[PDB]
Structures are given as structure tokens and as C-alpha cells.
């Protein structure tokens, strides 16, 4: 929903974005340009919505009044990243997005990369690789049927089979320097954007959640000077789009809650 208004933006699997006027119960426009399913969408007070194209790996910000669109692409390659260092997993798909500002937004990839973006720059301005860590390595007693333990260990191929967590959820409080990321790692991570808006750091973590964090929301109350924030995140045993993710031990279906207070 466009903030403080009745326009609704709907992203559909037919590679299109549809726009709606709830007060009028009618369709306004159909928006074209994504090459693959438009998995997530975000909106702020202005009409500048942003969307993410999943395997297309392109975050697009759309100017509805101007009928123009801006294309943003990561362009990150584990080759060059290793050489400048002299485990990095190539970006596979982008699945979450939330607009920190009308001039900034963040996106989460399936390789565990949380990237900060600016409208001026097409490439990312800052990136955080493997934000949620690496998935557990498969058990050796289950990888193969060979009796000898050394043979089964070889099938693990060391750390080559390891893969990173996916950023199932990502939400940023409007016009703030704090955003929350989620996965099935079993903990919610809260990040703080630097005041200069060219970097962000990990503010803290919340381990209460156990399961797939399908969506995250934040609600606040109290006086302007003293505010208490409540983080609500839907928790499920399976990913929202499909059942691909193997069962996570201890996962339960419920609504996670975390109340945080401000002091200084």
C-alpha cells in the first residue's frame, strides 16, 4: 500500500505489476518490464515503488507519474571478489526488498547477500555477504550408504557443498536508519544504517524466532521522545512460495513477537 493513501500495488507471477484503487474498486494500470516473476514490491508516501525480479536479478524502481523505470543490477562475481581479497557464493536471485527512503532501498538475495542501493548509482553502494551465515553441512552418516566413515566424508567434498542461507524476509522502518532481516537460521538480525547512508552494521540479534520468517513488520507506541517498538514476524515451517526447504529442526507455525525499548 502506498503510505497514507488508497493506491495498492500488486505484483503477479505473469511478470507484470498491477495498480489498484481500493476506494474505487477498480484497476488503474498494468506495468510491464520484468523478465521473470515479480516476487516482492514495496511502496512509500510517493508513488515510487520498487520491485525485484527473482532469477532476473534486477531491482527496478518505477516512476508512475513519469511512466519511466530505473534498472539496478548487482554485477558481482566471486572471481574478482577473491582476487581483491588476495567462501563467496554468486548471486542467484533477489527475493526481498524494502525502501528505506524515497531515495534509497535494500534488497536481499538467495545467496545471503544484503545490498544497499541508491537511486543515483545503478550498482550497489554497499553489500553484506553471507549475512545469515552458511547452512549446516549434510550429515556424513546420511550422505552415502558406504560403511566406512572415511568414504562418506569424501562425499561431503569438504566445504564445496555448503550453501548460504536465504534472506526470506527483509523490512526497514520508513525513513529510519534501522532495518530487520530474517531467514530460517533461527534468529532475527537487526541492522543499523550509518548516518551518512553509505554503509550499515549489525546492531543486534533476536534468537526467539525458530522457523522460516515469511514476513516481518514493526509497530510503535508511546510518546515521541520515548517509543517502544514491537517487531512481529510470521513464522512457518515452509517457505511461502514453495516447500523446497528441508524441515528445520524445532520449527513451529506461529507469530513471533519482540518488544524493544529506547533508552540513553
Partner 1 sequence: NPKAFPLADAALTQQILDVVQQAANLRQLKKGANEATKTLNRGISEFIIMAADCEPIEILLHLPLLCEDKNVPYVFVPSRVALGRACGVSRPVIAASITTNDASAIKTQIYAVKDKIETLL
Partner 2 sequence: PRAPRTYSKTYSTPKRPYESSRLDAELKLAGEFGLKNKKEIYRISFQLSKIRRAARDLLTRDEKDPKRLFEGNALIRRLVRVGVLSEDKKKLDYVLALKVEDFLERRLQTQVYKLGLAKSVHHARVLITQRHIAVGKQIVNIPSFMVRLDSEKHIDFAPTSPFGGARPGRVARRNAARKAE
Partner 3 sequence: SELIGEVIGARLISHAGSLTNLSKQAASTVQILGAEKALFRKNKGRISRYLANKCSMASRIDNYSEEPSNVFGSVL
Residues in touch with partner 2 (CB under 8 A)? 14-15, 30, 32-33, 35
Closest CA to 238 of 229, 226, 227, 247: 247
**Binding to partner 1, residues 105-124 (CB under 8 A):** 110
CA distances from 32 to 52, 115, 208 (A): 13, 24, 40
Minimum CB–partner distance for residue 238 and partner 3 (Å): 22
List alpha helices for 34-116, DSSP H: 78-85
Which of 7, 18, 20, 36 forms a contact with partner 1 (CB under 8 A)?
36
* Number of residues near partner 1 (by CB under 8 A): 29
Which of 83, 120, 139, 145 forms a contact with partner 3 (CB under 8 A)?
145
φ/ψ of residue 93, rounded to 5: -170, 155
Q: Between 241 and 259, whose beta carbon lies closer to partner 1?
A: 241
**Binding to partner 3, residues 56-85 (CB under 8 A):** none
Residue 163 in contact with partner 1, rule: CB under 8 A? yes
d(CA 182, CA 257): 13
Stretch that binds partner 3, among 18-26, 47-55, 142-150, 217-225 (CB under 8 A): 142-150
Residue 155 in contact with partner 1, rule: CB under 8 A? yes
Stretch that binds partner 3, among 92-100, 147-155, 202-210, 211-219 (CB under 8 A): 147-155
Residue 177 in contact with partner 1, rule: CB under 8 A? no
d(CA 209, CA 217): 14
Q: Between 68 and 141, whose beta carbon lies closer to partner 3?
A: 141
- Which partner in partner 2, partner 3, partner 1, none is near 32 (CB below 5 to 8 A by kind)? partner 2
CB atoms within 10 A of CB 155: 13
Residues in Cβ contact with 95 at an 8 Å cutoff, skipping those fewer than 6 apart: 39, 40, 52, 54, 108, 109, 110, 166, 167, 168
Minimum CB–partner distance for residue 11 and partner 1 (Å): 18
Residue 12 in contact with partner 1, rule: CB under 8 A? no
d(CA 39, CA 50): 11
Per-position x/- string for 77-106, each x denoting binding to partner 1 as judged by CB under 8 A, each - no binding:
xxx--------xxxxxx-------------
Q: Between 165 and 200, whose beta carbon lies closer to partner 1?
A: 165
d(CA 106, CA 189): 15
Residue 143 in contact with partner 3, rule: CB under 8 A? no
Minimum CB–partner distance for residue 144 and partner 3 (Å): 7
Which CB contacts under 8 angstroms, 24+ apart, belong to 190-196?
191/114, 191/128, 193/100, 193/116
Amino acid at each position: 500500500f502506498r503510505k497514507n493513501s488508497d493506491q495498492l500495488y500488486a505484483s503477479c507471477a505473469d511478470f507484470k505489476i498491477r495498480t489498484y484503487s481500493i476506494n474505487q474498486f477498480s484497476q488503474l494500470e498494468i506495468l510491464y518490464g520484468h523478465h521473470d516473476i515479480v516476487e516482492d514490491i514495496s511502496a512509500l508516501a510517493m508513488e515510487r515503488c520498487v520491485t525485484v525480479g527473482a532469477r532476473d536479478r534486477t531491482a527496478m524502481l518505477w516512476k508512475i507519474p513519469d511512466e519511466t523505470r530505473l534498472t539496478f543490477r548487482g554485477g558481482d562475481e566471486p572471481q574478482k571478489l577473491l582476487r581483491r581479497w588476495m567462501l563467496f557464493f554468486c548471486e542467484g536471485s533477489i527475493d526481498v526488498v524494502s525502501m528505506v527512503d524515497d531515495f534509497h532501498f535494500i534488497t536481499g538475495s538467495d545467496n545471503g547477500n544484503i545490498c544497499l542501493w541508491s537511486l543515483a548509482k545503478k550498482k550497489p553502494i554497499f553489500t553484506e555477504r553471507i549475512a545469515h551465515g552458511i547452512l549446516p553441512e549434510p550429515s556424513f552418516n546420511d550422505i552415502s550408504g558406504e560403511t566406512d566413515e572415511e568414504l562418506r566424508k569424501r562425499q561431503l567434498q569438504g566445504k564445496k557443498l555448503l550453501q548460504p542461507f536465504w534472506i526470506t524476509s527483509l523490512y526497514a522502518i520508513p525513513y529510519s536508519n534501522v532495518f530487520i532481516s530474517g531467514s530460517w537460521s533461527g534468529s532475527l538480525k537487526v541492522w543499523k544504517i550509518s548516518d551518512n547512508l553509505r554503509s550499515f552494521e549489525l546492531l543486534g540479534e533476536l534468537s526467539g524466532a525458530k522457523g522460516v520468517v515469511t514476513k516481518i513488520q514493526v509497530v510503535e507506541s508511546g510518546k515521541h521522545g520515548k517509543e517502544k517498538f514491537r517487531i512481529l514476524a510470521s513464522i512457518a515451517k515452509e517457505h511461502r512460495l514453495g516447500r523446497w526447504i528441508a524441515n528445520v529442526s524445532g520449527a513451529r507455525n506461529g507469530i513471533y513477537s519482540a518488544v524493544i525499548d529506547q533508552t540513553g
